[model samples]
Target: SPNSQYLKTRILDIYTPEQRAGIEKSEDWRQFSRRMDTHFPKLMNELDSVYGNNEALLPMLEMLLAQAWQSYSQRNSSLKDIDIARENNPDWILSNKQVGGVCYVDLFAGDLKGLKDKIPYFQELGLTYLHLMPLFKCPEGKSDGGYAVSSYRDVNPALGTIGDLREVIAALHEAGISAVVDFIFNHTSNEHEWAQRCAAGDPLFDNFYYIFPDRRMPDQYDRTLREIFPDQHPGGFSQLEDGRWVWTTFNSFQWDLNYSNPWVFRAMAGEMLFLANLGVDILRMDAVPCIWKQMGTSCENLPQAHALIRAFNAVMRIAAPAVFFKSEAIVHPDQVVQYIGQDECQIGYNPLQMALLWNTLATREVNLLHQALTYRHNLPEHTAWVNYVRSHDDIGWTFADEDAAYLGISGYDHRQFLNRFFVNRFDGSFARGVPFQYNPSTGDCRVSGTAAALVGLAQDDPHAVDRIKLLYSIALSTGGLPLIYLGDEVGTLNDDDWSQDSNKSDDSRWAHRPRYNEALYAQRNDPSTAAGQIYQDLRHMIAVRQSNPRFDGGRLVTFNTNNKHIIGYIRNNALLAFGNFSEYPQTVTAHTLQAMPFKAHDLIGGKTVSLNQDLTLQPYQVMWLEIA
Candidate 1:
């Protein structure tokens, strides 16, 4: 029987006899053979769906497997045990108890060591997953919120050293929190070694990015493409100093990679292995839909993009079973779901739910939000949405206008109202959000502000505190993991001076990225302050979410509260959640609660409720009641 020797000889056909003898005889083969036997089937199956027809399929598979074996062998023992734990339980991420928070290293804390000291603070707020915004090195001024990654190997010096990062990750792990970071594979900073070399006419870097000599090709692609950052440029193409064009979907510095070149896939896969070895649990795939581009198409959420992501998933399946990829595909609802799968992204941002959370607040009607929960909430097994009310970026109304039209709402007219209401342009508007990337031609726009500002904390608006509670209650009670945008728990308002900075003046999103106000942190325990009230309220809900078995999974059915101004849902068949959208008290008749067990305790108010009588909730009130 040839056993391992025979298979090794066949796999080493391209290598010299001497080279083959040394490598095959090494003990690493034993490790390689073990991992191959364990994960090769899934890897082969996933890659076949994307690149099976190629002649280099077998060679590429073997190469990726060899690298996976090495990555696994060198992986830290603690992380290795994590691989065991997560591999043994893939559904760990899908649990409702997993609450997440996102913040930047520079914005949230001073540096890695500073963040390390704040682990107890993270526990205070009950964060199980901490997604630190992109810390990798990037171009100096406005790096698309650090989306233009220059080197995956180096951490931003301002944040900390690579060693410091490893220590931070270790600390987070010790505290039982998963450390998340962005994996900006779609493009790299123009200063990235590969991008520079490709621009410098290096044969080794041929076709690494989509570079063109003139406007002819860009014009053809522009016919069907959507402008992501039109304020920065007229179209998706940016002119090099030499008058040539490069595909710059985001900014002139963030040149889109040419993934059609298969070698690009191999290079990115290498980077993925390196990150997985760094003990990173979750990598947020930034701008996932725009990774692949084609002329005469929108170049977003393309089929090839999904195929490539699935291939990348296969890489993780073999190399780092513990690491999960969360898709940040903030596109249309239909396009967003395409990125979520057991094979593509194990989890994805639920933009529809997020947008409608505020949509209900603006209109004081829950029809759109109800329709979304009914149709868009559920997902296939082993996958879930990272439910959030507000995030690091602006909020786009990604809900289907057609879905809204069914409820007798005009998509164009409603967006105008929403944009107006949120930006405080409408009468009696409580929101103080700034307009972002508004296009006059299309009448399309997005809103940018912290949760507190949009929920009415900006102008010391009355009921601002309850509005924050109402909005966040939905996020907490909704089935998936709730992502608190870090400073929102303490009611952090917009950055008052963000508009004054030249680099950030063009982008209103920076307005919401406020610094940590020490005064508020000092006042966090004083319930008299708005910041303290919000923090304690949110902390209470988070604690409830973690301790309650009712919030264990995403198996929820909307309660269909006949009133259009109230959103309602039933969780785990044991609890009913209701939120009042209107300013006045909203009431539900006994008929609506007839099926519930007579006496139920309200989690929000800590009071007993009766199903046999009418139930009334105060303005912007949220109820998490144990029915029976």
Candidate 2:
């Protein structure tokens, strides 16, 4: 491998002698040079660790460095300033003021232009970050809702042109909102030019994907592989038109990219730089665990996978310091935390906390939640969790089996009960969620529906409104960046027409991906409707969360309330948050409150709560009391 100094000299040769001399004297070049010096060794070490003895390692690093230099040089001036700002303030993501929202550009509005028009609404909702679901070009109809990318540069024609996307991103910046988008590097739509060319036996695109002429290799790999979307295919491999099989982890059309080829890293790095130049503040790393696959193992969360991500992290640090990564690893709790760090992903989805939140609601017990909060909630410095009640995807129960077993609960049977309870199959269940991706082979299931629908607002259960408040309250007060699914603020219900559409009928996740509810949104200020009630209550919580210093950092301690139906935690040791997950009133005895302050101000109700006596909470109530 070439030394850093030698590589730096080669990179500078791209410019004229005079231009090179002037560039070396500029502040941009100075910062870039320093970053290259600091991060290049790690990049080289990581790449070498993964691709040792492979012929593409040396030349690929050279190509990647050239692109990094050029991309940093072409980056916009404002974005460069932001790069410096973020490089200095690595913990900006941990700020309580940084609230986020996610939506599909086509569903939330009509297209990119329509989404731009809704910036005022985002501002009104106090969103500091906006995650627009995959807007890139993909196959028509069931393209896994744009997860399958055909072209990284082309915007979906239905959404708008690439110029419109740039304009929208600029507008968001002007409105004090950072733009976030998906980076689906694990696979590409079969219609993608590279996939087609590789499938056709082109030499340049050979080994770009894992293609097999027979099931010999596929069958061997499937021995330890877990089914991701069993509803789509049997194992991880999917059949092709030419009697060959390609690795398709999610959909048959989405062929898994082969990272074993060094050129693949260079190709995706070029695309990453393209997105960095588009003013994207964060790239949501989708399916991060499935990037690197090996035989005789689960092929998920392999060591090479972490090295690949850390390499990507180093590349961004050198080329685009302002751009951060949000990991979408919905795996085991132990594997999930491994993805979050200052050197890898700066932020990640808290799937364990999210799943356990729903678990506690179903069981009306806080044991598992308290266990997770006590152990799994704290993260490495300069990193934070994107805590959310619901997102654009379905909820998978991802709690640890060992943690549950310690509490005398069986993980498998408990999941069966929870799944039945949420889908309204359990007797006396108040939830109305529909089943998604039910795998009969393993009896594994996930639930799909909006937060309101799952909380029983579809049937107008009286406690539904408070249930929404209770869930969102935990997500908001729990120390991290809170993400609100766009229509969830006003309690948008599931779209009932999803089953009738041929293109979407197979995917039940679309049920919760409803279009903007104009009627519900209009009643946001009216207090008479359910929409208004949910809106005002959520808005109040958002306001308090942003202004309070007690909820400033992503660290907390479990406050044992000694009440089975109540979930409790303290934020920064100043804000005591207690939530009642049941539909009936619950009490925290004075014995549990004796350790707390005698009197505290309840931020939710704006009243003084005295802790000297037994504290009785209303049905499904949430309290953020300042104990100082």
Candidate 3:
């Protein structure tokens, strides 16, 4: 087996002895060599486990290292300083001050330049991190919201130029906000150069994507494969125009990369370096579980998938230490956490918490939510959750079935109920969400709607504003980087005309991807409007979360409120939070608060509450009590 020293010599062999002498003396080489020495072992170990004894591994590793050196040498000095600072403080993402907001560049503002103009607004809203949705080049129409990347190097023309994106990143950094963008590593649009070349049978790009001559292999693999978007296709394989079968985990235009090919890793690593040098602080690893596939298995969250991500992490550690990964694995809770680690993804979407928050609202019970908080909330050191209320995708009931079973709930039946309830098929449901990708054969369905729309703001229910506040308060106070779905703070509703657009009609998720509402934004400061009420309520929580020391770290103890309608948790052993998911008034018994002080200040209401007596929470009310 080739070791790090052996690889280092081979990497240096590309240059002549005198040239190498000069190169080795440079500051860039000094930094790159040191990082290689530190992070190479883990890289070697991970890649070796995935592609053992492969003839192509050595050549690919050497080429990748060469690019890493060049990339590190060309890295900006300001970004290099950030790299060192982030390396020293690995837990910076876990700080209470790290609040996040996500939105599409075009929807939130007009384009990249407009996005730059919104940096002051972002700072005013207490945002320290901003996640821009995918802005890469894709097919002209029906591009899975730009997940089908035609070119990683080029910015979508509708959005802006590549120079504009860099300026946006620089401006975000200037305002003390980290810039985040999607790293759609699992697949690429059929029009991508590599995908086109591979399909054209170019020797250099052969096997870059999984293309089979017939359905024989694809059929065998489909036996155990799970359908992601059954509404678009039947299984994992999609037929090419030339009658060949290609692996398309998402849309037919999105071809899954063959990670078995070591060259693909190197290729993707180069693209990652491109984004890193563009000053991206974090790359959201889109659909992380689908990166690796094998026959006779579900082909998701495979061990090789993790090894590949860790290998990518190793490359970033050496070449772009300032860049971190946010895992987009919306899988089961158990599999979701597997992708979250210091060496894999430093942060991941907390689908379990996000899903269950809605579940509690629907069922009007906190049993499942309490169980999750007690057992699954705290993460490993140097890792955190990206807790969110909604995103640019549909919500699937991804909580562990085993955990649900423990609470005497049937997962399948509960999901059916949730689907029905959210779509308003169930009588008296306040939610106005629509169903997405409903699979009749498997009885699997997901819900799609804006946070405000689902919480009844669309129909103007009396409790709609508080419902939004209640859900967001939990996300803000939870021990992680709380992400606000930008327009949710001002109670933006669903896009009613989504179905009218031919390109967007097939995807119900577009219902929540409404354009920025200028009217609602104008009403944000008016106390009389629903928009203003939601804006003030959410901004208050954001302010409290950022300013309070009690919410410092990503660790919490689930408090037993002893009320099924109320969810309780304690942060840093000082701040106790209670959220009433029920629309009706709920009371936390004084006996349940026996361990608390006689009186504690309620941060939400700015009043002292007597914990010695029963605490009553009004309809959908949320309270953050300083109990220390």
Write the number of the candidate with greater TM-score, choosing between 1 and 3.
Answer: 3
Report every candidate's CA lDDT. Answer: 0.85, 0.93, 0.93
Which 10 successive residues of model 1 have the least lDDT summed?
1-10
**What local lDDT does model 1 show for residue 424?**
91
Clashing pairs in 2: none
* Residue 551, candidate 2: alpha-carbon lDDT: 91
Q: lDDT tens string, model 2, 1-628? A: 6677889888899889999999889887887889999999889888988999788788889889989998998999999999999999999999999899999999999999999999999999999999999999999898999999999999999999999999999999999999999999999999999999999999999999999999999999999999988989988999998899999999999999999999999899999999999999999999999999989988899989999999999999999999999999999999999999999999999999889889988898989999999999999999999999999889999999888999999999999999999999999888888899899988889999999999899999998999889998988888888999999999999999999999999898999999999999999999989999999999999999999999998999988898999989998889999999877899999888987889999999999999999999999999899987
Give all TM-scores, in the order shown: 0.95, 0.99, 0.99
Q: What is the TM-score (0 to 1) of candidate 1?
A: 0.95
**Candidate 1 C-alpha lDDT tens digits along 1-628:** 1133444456666569898777667655554565556555555555566565777566665665556666766877777778768877878877867999998888888899999988899988889999998888988888887888999899999999999999999999889899898888989999999999999999999999999999999999988878777778867889999889999998889989888777788888989989898899998998999887877889998887888888888777766778898999888788898888877898999999899989988888898999988888888888888889898899998889789889888989999999999999999898999999988668889999999999888788778999888888888887887898988888899997989898788999998999887878888899999989989899889988999888878768998787878889988888799999999999988998787788989887888888799988889889999973
Model 2, position 207: C-alpha lDDT score: 95
Collision pairs in model 1:
none
Q: How much is 235 displaced in model 2, in angstroms?
A: 0.6
RMSD of each: 2.8, 0.9, 1.0
Count of backbone collisions within predicted model 1: 0
Q: Please state the error at residue 606 of candidate 1 in Å.
A: 1.3
CA lDDT, candidate 2, residue 154:
96
Q: Per-residue alpha-carbon lDDT of model 3 for 1-628, expressed as tens digits?
A: 6777777777788799999999889887888888888999999999999999999998899899989988888999999999999989999999999999999999999899999988998988889999999998989979998899999988999899999998899989989999999999999999999998999999999999999999899999989988889999989999989999999999989999999999999999999999999999999999999989999988999999999999999999999998999999888888999999999999999999999999999999999989999999999999999999999999999999999999899999999999999999999999999999999889999999999989998889999999889988988888999999999989999999999899999999999999989999899999999989999988899999999999998999998898999999999989999999888889998888888999999999999999998999998989999988
